[PDB]
Design a protein around this ligand. Structure first.
Ligand code: MG
Ligand code: MG
Lengths: 228, 7, 228, 7
């Protein structure tokens, strides 16, 4: 629906929507920008991610409220409404995955862009896995795993251990292990090794880079404290 | 319950 | 779009949407319930109000962010996007006003229901007035005034001074005077007289009614402190 | 800036 708007105007409006906390608008603007067909800059990738993370995060929070109510119950209403929110969430995940597949990932040649998009792919398959119950649930989980794994392999070869996207990827892959793959020991081992290797690389960083890296290290620490 | 990446 | 769902199911789903903080869904469910054509209960009126207040409140907050950015600026993007949010907000206000006019108000015979709906009518004309700039802005303001005034006349004849809907109506009419009608002295006089007459009636109340009434009296006090 | 009714 955004085909008639200039790319630069879509980007500018995404930034305005973020300031206005209008994340559905933000996501639609960034979808339109992606569909222009040009690669995304560092800042533009972050806008795309923030927009859809906020949209799907609200849907996930609602699905969890409704799923909890449904479990305490077990009329059709709670199930029906949970299913409605679930379908909407799946639609958003499918939209994001479609943007990644057509054609963000294949055009991403630099490590920073390719890891960013593969992390996104793992995340949105993870969100699909959170609600999945059918014949394809194991394949959804393995799709998340495969995307995260490719991102990890690239990040370990091409980025320093303190790189924020490498750290956030490892954080989210550890959450995948703990919550989705029922592999808490893998989750703990990944978080600990990631934290320790970043700690040993902090000395190389400027004050501003140090702030970015230690912020995500604290999230790894919070999970390790929760898990151990 | 655990924290995934968030800004 | 809700014509095929049972009234009771729409009400139940509105309550679920509120728990899930899915206020757009909540509003759509309550719109469908209203369009069943039966009068609304006390609790159902409150669900309708909460739903649309949350929807339009988000739009108003976004419009204020964008309007502020636009003023600091004065490309077309900020104006265009403010206009988009403004049109969406006006559409929601028109939908609510249409529900009130077809046919909630005309079927509301009891003072409690009629005052409730006339307060809503004043509020949504007030929200239209907040963004209005054209040939009809004075008529929008007078439409808010007339709705609030009729509600006030009924409430003063038919309800005790501590009645929560009477108190909330007077609170919002005072905000109308201060913010919309540029009548701060009228706003202050209304808030003070409302507070004092409620104070003198608290002795008649149960503990639970006392809690409801004093909560809204505190909002009147907060405004008087802001305004004086 | 002033408070209108809110739950
Ligand atoms: Mg390339
Ligand atoms: Mg009647």
């Amino acid at each position: 629906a955004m085909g008639s708007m200039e790319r630069a105007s879509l980007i500018q409006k995404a930034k305005l929507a973020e300031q206005a906390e209008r994340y559905e608008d933000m996501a639609a603007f960034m979808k339109g920008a992606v569909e222009k067909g040009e690669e995304l800059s560092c800042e533009e990738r972050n806008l795309l991610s923030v927009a859809y993370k906020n949209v799907v995060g609200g849907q996930r929070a609602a699905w969890r409220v409704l799923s909890s109510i449904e479990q305490k119950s077990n009329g059709p209403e709670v199930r029906e409404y949970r299913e409605k929110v679930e379908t909407e969430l799946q639609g958003v995940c499918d939209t994001v995955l479609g943007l990644l597949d057509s054609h963000l990932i294949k055009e991403a040649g630099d490590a920073e862009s390719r890891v960013f998009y593969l992390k996104m792919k793992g995340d949105y398959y993870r969100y699909l896995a959170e609600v999945a119950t059918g014949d394809d649930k194991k394949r959804i989980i393995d799709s998340a795993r495969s995307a995260y794994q490719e991102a990890m392999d690239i990040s370990k070869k091409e980025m320093p251990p303190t790189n924020p996207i490498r750290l956030g990827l490892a954080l989210n892959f550890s959450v995948f292990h703990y919550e989705i793959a029922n592999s808490p020991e893998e989750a703990i081992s990944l978080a600990k090794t990631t934290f320790d290797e970043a700690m040993a690389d902090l000395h190389t960083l400027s004050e501003d880079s140090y702030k970015d890296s230690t912020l995500i290290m604290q999230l790894l620490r919070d999970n390790l404290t929760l898990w151990t | 319950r655990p924290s995934s990446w968030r800004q």
